[PDB]
Structure 1
């Protein structure tokens, strides 16, 4: 009812191959990889940041 955020699919390097909501998954394969790896890093980084 709020629509304050929007929940995006939590990709990984195993989901990488099967997630198609975010585009570029085969089109821009290395780009896609970067995005997914980057996302993962952010998640990890966020966790670490939170801890800090």
Structure 2
């Protein structure tokens, strides 16, 4: 956390945008949600899908190959 804060303050990293959900949509951007409801909904869902995609990519990237699963099992 300290490293991320130092990166943000130093300018190497952009500041973190607020996390927004469906229940959090109005509380974060009520002024923007009134003028453009569908656009704000699309932006919020895009952020949520980006978070989910990052989670899946992290999980899958670090996944034992099917042959590698056997290699661990064939060795133990």
For normalisation by structure 1, the TM-score amounts to: 0.81
Structure 2: unaligned runs, 5 residues or longer:
1-8, 61-76
Q: Which has the higher contact order (CA 8 A, sep 6+)?
A: 1
Aligned residues: 50
Match of 1:19 in 2: 28
Structure index of larger Rg: 2
Segments ≥4 residues shifted beyond 2 Å: none
**Greater fraction helix:** 2
Contact conserved, 1:19 with 1:25, CA < 8 A, in 2?
Answer: no
RMSD: 1.5
Structure 1: unaligned runs, 5 residues or longer:
none
